[PDB]
Each structure stands twice: as C-alpha cells, then as structure tokens.
Design a protein around this ligand. Structure first.
Ligand code: NAG
Ligand code: NAG
Ligand code: NAG
Ligand code: NAG
Ligand code: NAG
Ligand code: NAG
Ligand code: NAG
Ligand code: NAG
Ligand code: NAG
Ligand code: NAG
Ligand code: NAG
Lengths: 209, 228, 344
C-alpha cells in the first residue's frame, strides 16, 4: 500500500520566516497538502504536487522532487500557522505542527518542585509537580528521578502559550502515583534541560521540612 | 457555490451509536460522492469511507467495517437536483472514537484532480465518547516553600467534562498567573494546575485563595494556599 | 497523419422495419443499414495510445440509449417539475439488438487488436475501420451481459487500481449462461439459474488474475456494503420487466479455495419490481405490473463490475465487491478498443 512519512513533527517559526515540510511516499500518485487551524475545518492548500487550490496565495509552493514531496511557505503570516497534512488517496501523513514563535533573548527557566499536599495523600494518591517558569526558547525537557531511578509513563506535561508581554514560556510536569508507592520512597527530583542552562538543573526534596 | 453543513456536537457513552448528517447544496448531488474523514486527537486524519449520490454505493475503510454505515437522501424530481443529505452512522463506540468528524467533496474536475482532492469541507462535528459522568473537581494546594520570589498554586484533579476556570483572589491577583491547559488522565478525568509567582515577603502577610469554577456540575470552591 | 478528435457519430444496424420491438423501431429511424463487406485496413509500424476511460464515444452511446428509453419506456408515474406526471404505459416488446457506431466524413476509427490490451496505453496492432462491431445496449448492474469476450487472457481493466474510487472491469474470456425465469401460473417471484461448476471455475481464474495485480494477496469477494437495490442486486431489464436478483450466492469464497460441496446449479432469488430508481438518474419511476405467462431470457455473463475496499490495511487479503458505477462503464467495456481520429 501507500506509506506517508511526514517530517518534521513540529516546526517553530516567527512571522516573515519560511517553513519547509516534507512527505516521503512509497508510491507516486497525486499528493495533496491540507492546513487545519484549531477549531476550524481543514483546507486544501496544494494538490497534484504543486498546483495551488482556490484563494491560496503564491507564497505557498510545492516541489515534485524525488519520492519526497515538499511544501514551502515563504513570508509566513499569522493565518499560515497550524497543522499541515500530506495526503495520497485515503492515506494521510502524521502531520506537521507549524506554530508561531516571537524571537527574544534566551532566558533560563526558574525551576520549582511541589510535594503532594496532605489532603490528597488521604485519597490514596500523590501528585508531584515541577514548574518551569518564564524561559525561552520553548524547547525544554523534564526528567523525573525517584531515588536515583528514572521514571516513564507516570508523568504528564503541559505548556502555556507564549506570553504577550515578556515573550516567555512556562511548563508544568505532574508525576502521579499511589500513596502506598509514594511512601515507599524518600528522594524525589525533576531534572531540567534547556538551551539557557549550561548544565542540567535539578530540584529535589525529601520529607523533612 | 458548494456548501456542506453538518449537524451539531454530541456526547456519547461507550458501546452506543451516533448518527451524523451533512446537508449539501450548490451542485448536482447525484453526479458526485461524499467522503467522511475524522480528526483524532493525537492520531491525525483517518479516512472513513465514501458514498456516491447516484445510487448510494458505499466503500468503508477496512479497519472500520462492521461499525459504520452511510446512506444518502436526495430529490426524485430531476428539476431539483442541486441538494442532498449524506448520513454517517457509527456504532460500537469507544473512547478512541472521540474525534472531529467532517464531510468532504472533491474539487472541480480536472486531469489532475483525483477523487481524494477535497476542495470542500463541512464545518465538522465533534463527537466525544466517554464512560465518565459529570464530576466536580477536587482541589489541593501546591504549597509554597523554602530576587527571592516564591511559587504557589492549586492542583485541580479529576473533573468531567471541560472546562474549569481558575481565578486568584476573586480575580484581583492576575500578575504572574499561569493556568496550564487541562490534561486527560488515563482514568478519563481531566486535571490541571494553576500557579502564581509572588513575593516571598508576602507569604507571612497576604492571603492567597484560588477560586475554581466548573459549570457542568454547578460547583464553586475557594481554597486557601499556605506553607505547612 | 491524423489527431485524436471528438465528433458526432452515426449508428448502423440490421434492424427489421416490420418488428414492433422497441430497439428495432428506434434503430429503423436512427440508424442506416449495415455494410455487408466492411473494409478493415491494418496500419504497419504504427503506435497509438488509447484510453477507454477518456473516450467520448461512450458519451454518445449513453445519449442514444437514454434517447431510446425516453421514447419507448416512459413510466406510468414519475416526478418532474414539482408535479407528478401520469402517462399511458402499455406493455412493450423488449430485446436489445447490436448497434454499430460509425464515423462521418473526415474522420475514422482506430481499432486496437492487441489480444491482451487492458484499455489504456500504447497499441501496436492497430487497424482502421469505418464502424465499430455490433454492440448491444444491455443496461445492467454487477454483471455484464451479452457482450464480447476477451480473445486470450482474462483482462482486468481500471483507470487506476490503487484508487479505490475507480471501478474495476473484469473482462471474461469464457461466457457463463445466466438463466432467469418468472414461472407462469406471487407473480413477482422469479429466479436465475447458473451452473455452479462453470461459475466457480471462472471466478477462481479471476482471483488468480487479480493476484497478479495485487501482489499475490489473498483475494476475497463479499456482497455489496449498501446502496439502492439497483446496485446491491443484479439489476437488469428482461422482456420489458425490471429484474432484481440476489447475487449473494455468486460470490461464495468457500467454493473457490484450494474441497467442494457446491458443484451443482446455483439458483438466485429474484424479484420483478414496479417502483424503480431510473438508471438515467432521472429519479423514481413507477411501472405497471408484469405481463402474464412465462417471462424468460438466457444471457451470457461476459464481465464483472467490482469495487475494492479501501482504508489502511496490511491484512493479507484484499476485498472486492460486485457493483461498478455508471451504466457508462457498460459501454466502456465494449468501446475500450476504439477511438476516433480526424484526418489531415
Ligand atoms: C493514478 O492515480 C493517482 C492517484 O489516484 C493520480 O495521481 C494519477 O494522476 C493517476 N494517473 C492518471 C494517468 O491520471
Ligand atoms: C516505421 O517502420 C519502418 C519500417 O520498419 C521504419 O523504417 C520507419 O522509420 C518507422 N517509422 C519511424 C517513425 O521510425
Ligand atoms: C495497462 O497497461 C499499461 C501499459 O501499457 C499500464 O501502465 C497499466 O497499469 C495497465 N493497466 C492495468 C489495469 O493493469
Ligand atoms: C500483433 O499482431 C500480429 C498480426 O495479427 C500477430 O501475429 C502478433 O501475435 C501480435 N503481436 C504479438 C506481440 O504477438
Ligand atoms: C453466448 O455465449 C456463447 C458461448 O458460450 C456464444 O457462442 C453465443 O454466441 C453467446 N450468445 C449471445 C452473446 O447472445
Ligand atoms: C481464459 O484466460 C485464462 C488466463 O487468464 C486462461 O488460463 C484460460 O485458459 C482462458 N480460457 C479458458 C476457457 O481456459
Ligand atoms: C432455463 O431455465 C428454465 C427453468 O424454468 C428451463 O425451463 C429452460 O429449459 C432453461 N433454458 C436453458 C437454455 O438452460
Ligand atoms: C456445468 O458444467 C459442467 C461442465 O464442466 C457440466 O458437466 C454440468 O452438467 C454443468 N451443470 C449442469 C447443471 O448442467
Ligand atoms: C441476499 O440473500 C442473503 C441470504 O443468502 C441475505 O442475507 C441478503 O440480505 C440478500 N440480499 C439482499 C440485498 O437482500
Ligand atoms: C456459501 O457456502 C456455504 C457453505 O460454506 C453455504 O452454507 C452458503 O449457503 C453459501 N452461500 C451462498 C450465498 O450460496
Ligand atoms: C441476451 O441475449 C439473448 C439472446 O440474444 C436474449 O434472449 C436475452 O434476453 C438477452 N439478455 C438481456 C438481459 O437482454
């Protein structure tokens, strides 16, 4: 059948810059590109390789280059941002997310860690939070360690939109598990990686304050 | 001009069914086909099937066979050809069927334009499938602790459905507030956090209340945040 | 030399002016007498590209058959212009005859003679004729009846097999009789008889030929997923009556594996209907109840219309279902080897 490898998964740009999305196909049929903005219906951008659909400006362009179809969007406007998909027959690419970013100086995240409250611990559950506040760029990695042991699956991340005034990002990470499990261990820590940090910063706690 | 107008959003329990309509106009409905496609949160686009206007012939995606059916409706008067209604029925629903369902039609015929090049889209129909019942949130305090600014916040857990709003001190404390987008837990219930960086000198002085509002369950709950 | 061109063709047949049969009456006025000694000229060192899916000759035929039915098969009741029309709908005599299509002055028809031509692409063995062969305007769904057979191999025709929206035309090289009968004596009950041995052997060959095109994947048949009765059933007109025959038995996979238990006659349940969705796309029409006596017609299954299931899948198998699309595809199945050109 047809497989459609789309890349990159995410793309962070500012107005006026150019986006380059690609799509590798196993077949050679008619490829099309769609744009889907949040809370809006997807819209045909390009079809049959390089032909623009109705209304679409000339800054959108596609190239027929190899088994690799590419979509170029030059001089990005605010309306050009969203999630783009390539399509061949009934098959779709995994989707590329093109989101706005406003260029500003680099800023290291202030890192805070929050132990579980007592009220929650009386519900057989314990949540541990690791806040990354006011940093740039947005790309950051949080990594939980409990008694020197790396965690996976038991954490969920959440990010805010870019702030209007100071052009920064904040990020939360919630390590969730059962009270029984929580009590078994002593040390809890989240490790933060970021361009604004020379080395990975760590925040941690035990139960003794 | 071509117009595709779908029916409204709906909530559903697992194992139940959902029927969606798509009102078409502006073209001879018999001479075209309506495809259905869904936008799944975190999984992208998935083609469901198509139906042809002429006879109502259908082709369903293999992975969805036995759970979907498509019918259409149009005028039997050849002097009123420029409208029709396509239907999509989805049965044996699961949480994985939670998605935005769209009805689409191909662009103007050309040597290049295949049948899967969709110029026209319905506005979409949001279907949410959940076992969870309407449930108000439990609120816990993210206590502050040890250029010295302290961080505190409120942990709002296990509520359904969205949304919940969080204000601080009756909405008077706005400087430094970050209320993160909600997150769906494996339990099927929503959770979020709201934090605020403040002067560490104010922890012995000022009061910090987080006001949590959740319309779907008629619950308002104020919560005090302090250290230890 | 010449260039591919579109023009108005004229028809030719052996219609009998004394016949009251509807096709004969139509052909008598519309067509000229057939040529006893047609002159077919083969062209040496000539390559010509054909495209059965982009052939306007099909459009012409469609209009002739539409015109035919419009003149002689007006229904008792129908919707038109916001009103319901009531017409006198007497029983007619109905039996399609072969119609030849011929080029006017300045044009000529090129004819691919490659015994395994699939409908699209270059042709080497090209000949020049003034008229096509005799084509019967048999309107039907699922099964193609009373057509021409493929000379050599079984031929799979499709504009693009990867596209599930494109109809697949199977061109058989051996016919299978279908024997449909309304017994004289429920007056609407009928049945079609088919030789299970004949059919299941043919269907087996179709799958193996389909494997060649779909990389030896497990070929499966299934009944139609849905739609009007005119498609989910084998729909055709016989002696002026509209038949609807269930073909659920004609696509039984158990009988075309690699054991038996099904080597005898296949009897398809059928029903003569009065209220019908017209194939012209004109809407619902209402006809009078069936003539008395024994209504019968023996036809040759010369082809099969298929649509392939789509969707993301790498299960071993590919599923095909009976039913094609336009009645135009029935004309395509015969005109696939012809194209009109203008002389320079
Ligand atoms: C074959 O199919 C693909 C996809 O349906 C399409 O891009 C291509 O144009 C088709 N070939 C022709 C000759 O139209
Ligand atoms: C056609 O065939 C003849 C004889 O084989 C050859 O000499 C001639 O060049 C061919 N035509 C073309 C265009 O090559
Ligand atoms: C028919 O043959 C042409 C080459 O002449 C090929 O490109 C096309 O895929 C074939 N069609 C089918 C349905 O096999
Ligand atoms: C082309 O036609 C000639 C003449 O009828 C025939 O002998 C030949 O078999 C055909 N081509 C091939 C490759 O067989
Ligand atoms: C039916 O098929 C047989 C071969 O099985 C053929 O000899 C006969 O001429 C056909 N009759 C038609 C097409 O009317
Ligand atoms: C029909 O074509 C197939 C090849 O697809 C061939 O094996 C078979 O012999 C032909 N006809 C008959 C009656 O065998
Ligand atoms: C067709 O079937 C009918 C069944 O009533 C039978 O009388 C007739 O002899 C059959 N004819 C042929 C040619 O098989
Ligand atoms: C079906 O065809 C076979 C020949 O392969 C023949 O022997 C048999 O009699 C036919 N079926 C009937 C019911 O006559
Ligand atoms: C055809 O017959 C089968 C039984 O073999 C039945 O289940 C099916 O509904 C019938 N088809 C139609 C279209 O009624
Ligand atoms: C298919 O074969 C089965 C036996 O496996 C039989 O019971 C069934 O009636 C057949 N289906 C049709 C539609 O003839
Ligand atoms: C097919 O041709 C035969 C003989 O010419 C005829 O008896 C039969 O009615 C025809 N079939 C249809 C569906 O018209």
């Amino acid at each position: 059948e047809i497989v459609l490898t789309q890349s990159p998964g995410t793309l962070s740009l500012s107005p006026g810059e150019t986006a380059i999305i690609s799509c590798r196909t196993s077949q050679y049929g008619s490829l099309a590109w769609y744009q889907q903005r949040p809370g809006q219906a997807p819209r045909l951008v390009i079809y049959s390789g390089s032909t623009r659909a109705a209304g679409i400006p000339d800054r959108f362009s596609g190239s027929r280059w190899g088994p690799d179809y590419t979509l170029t969007i030059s001089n990005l406007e605010s309306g050009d941002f969203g999630v783009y998909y390539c399509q061949q027959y009934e098959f779709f690419g995994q989707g590329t997310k093109v989101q706005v970013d406003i260029k500003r100086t680099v800023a290291a995240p202030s890192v805070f860690i929050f132990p579980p409250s007592d009220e929650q611990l009386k519900s057989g559950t314990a949540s541990v939070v690791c806040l990354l506040n006011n940093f740039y760029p947005r790309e950051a990695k949080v990594q939980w360690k409990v008694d020197n042991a790396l965690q996976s699956g038991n954490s969920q991340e959440s990010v805010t939109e870019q702030d209007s005034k100071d052009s920064t990002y904040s990020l939360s990470s919630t390590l969730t598990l059962s009270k029984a499990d929580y009590e078994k261990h002593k040390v809890y820590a989240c490790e933060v990686t970021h361009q604004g940090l020379s080395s990975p910063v760590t925040k941690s706690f035990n139960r003794g304050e | 001009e071509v117009r595709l107008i779908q029916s409204g959003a709906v909530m559903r329990k697992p194992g139940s069914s959902v029927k969606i309509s798509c009102r078409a106009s502006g073209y001879n409905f018999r001479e075209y086909s309506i495809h259905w496609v869904r936008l799944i949160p975190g999984r992208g686009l998935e083609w469901i099937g198509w139906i042809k206007g002429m006879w109502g012939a259908v082709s369903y995606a293999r992975q969805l066979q036995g759970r979907v059916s498509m019918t259409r409706q149009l005028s039997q008067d050849p002097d009123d050809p420029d409208w029709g209604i396509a239907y999509l029925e989805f049965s044996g629903l699961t949480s994985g069927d939670t998605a935005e369902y769209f009805c689409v039609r191909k662009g103007p015929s050309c040597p290049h334009c295949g049948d899967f090049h969709w110029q026209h889209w319905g506005q979409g129909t949001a279907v949410v499938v959940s076992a969870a019942s309407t449930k108000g949130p439990s609120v816990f305090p993210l206590a502050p602790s040890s250029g010295g600014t302290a961080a505190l916040g409120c942990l709002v857990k296990d509520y359904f459905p969205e949304p919940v709003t969080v204000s601080w001190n009756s909405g008077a404390l706005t400087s430094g507030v970050h209320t993160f987008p909600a997150v769906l837990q494996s339990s099927g219930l929503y959770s979020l956090s709201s934090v605020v960086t403040v002067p560490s000198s104010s922890l012995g002085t000022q009061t910090y209340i987080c006001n949590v509002n959740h319309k779907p369950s008629n619950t308002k709950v104020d919560k005090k945040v302090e250290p230890k | 030399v010449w260039k591919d061109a579109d023009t108005t063709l004229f028809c030719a047949s052996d219609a009998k002016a004394h016949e009251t049969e509807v096709h004969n009456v139509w052909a008598t006025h519309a067509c000229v007498p057939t040529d006893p000694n047609p002159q077919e000229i083969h062209l040496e060192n000539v390559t010509e590209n054909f495209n059965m899916w982009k052939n306007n000759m099909v459009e012409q035929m469609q209009e002739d058959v539409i015109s035919l039915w419009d003149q002689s098969l007006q229904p008792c009741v129908k919707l038109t212009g916001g009103s319901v029309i009531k017409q006198a709908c007497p029983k007619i005599s109905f039996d399609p005859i072969p119609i030849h299509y011929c080029t006017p002055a300045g044009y000529v028809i090129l004819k691919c003679n490659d015994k395994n031509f699939n409908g699209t692409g270059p042709c080497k063995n090209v000949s020049s004729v003034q008229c096509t062969h005799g084509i019967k305007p048999v309107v039907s769904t699922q099964l193609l009846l009373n057509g021409s057979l493929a000379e050599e191999e079984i031929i799979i025709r499709s504009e693009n097999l990867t596209n599930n929206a494109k109809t697949i035309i199977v061109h058989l090289n051996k016919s299978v009789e279908i024997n449909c009968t309304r017994p004289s004596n429920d007056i609407r009950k009928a049945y079609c008889e088919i030789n299970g041995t004949k059919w299941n052997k043919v269907l087996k060959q179709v799958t193996e030929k389909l494997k060649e095109h779909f990389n030896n994947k497990t070929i499966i048949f299934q009944p139609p997923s849905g739609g009007d009765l005119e498609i989910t059933m084998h729909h055709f007109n016989c002696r002026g009556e509209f038949f609807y025959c269930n073909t659920t038995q004609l696509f039984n996979n158990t009988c075309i594996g690699n054991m038996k238990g099904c080597n005898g006659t296949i009897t398809l349940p059928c029903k003569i209907k009065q209220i019908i969705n017209m194939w012209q796309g004109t809407g619902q029409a209402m006809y009078a109840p069936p003539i008395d006596g024994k209504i019968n017609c023996v036809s040759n299954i010369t082809g099969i219309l298929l649509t392939r299931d789509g969707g993301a899948n790498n299960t071993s198998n590919e599923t095909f279902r009976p039913g094609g699309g336009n009645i135009k595809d029935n004309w395509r199945s015969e005109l696939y080897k012809y194209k009109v050109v203008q002389i320079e």
